[PDB]
A paper describes a structure:
The design of proteins that bind to a specific site on the surface of a target protein using no information other than the three-dimensional structure of the target remains a challenge. Here we describe a general solution to this problem that starts with a broad exploration of the vast space of possible binding modes to a selected region of a protein surface, and then intensifies the search in the vicinity of the most promising binding modes. Biophysical characterization shows that the binders, which are all smaller than 65 amino acids, are hyperstable and, following experimental optimization, bind their targets with nanomolar to picomolar affinities.
Unlike antibodies, the designed proteins are soluble when expressed in E. coli at high levels and are thermostable, and hence could form the basis for a next generation of lower cost protein therapeutics.
Author numbering: 1 to 55
Write the structure that this text describes.
């Protein structure tokens, strides 16, 4: 699930105190629910958020 991936990343960012990445994961989720981003672009966003989280 793209949604489950983004929720897990949001919580990992909350655990790291990474407030920008919290917002990006949270808002990709909101955009996906609103139909403002495609599922494929949300999945790619999750992958990028994960990369930035590791840095």
């Amino acid at each position: 699930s793209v949604i489950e991936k983004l929720r897990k990343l949001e919580k990992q960012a909350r655990k790291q105190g990474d407030e920008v990445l919290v917002m990006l994961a949270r808002m990709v989720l909101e955009y996906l629910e609103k139909g403002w981003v495609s599922e494929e672009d949300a999945d790619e966003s999750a992958d990028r958020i994960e990369e930035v989280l590791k840095k």
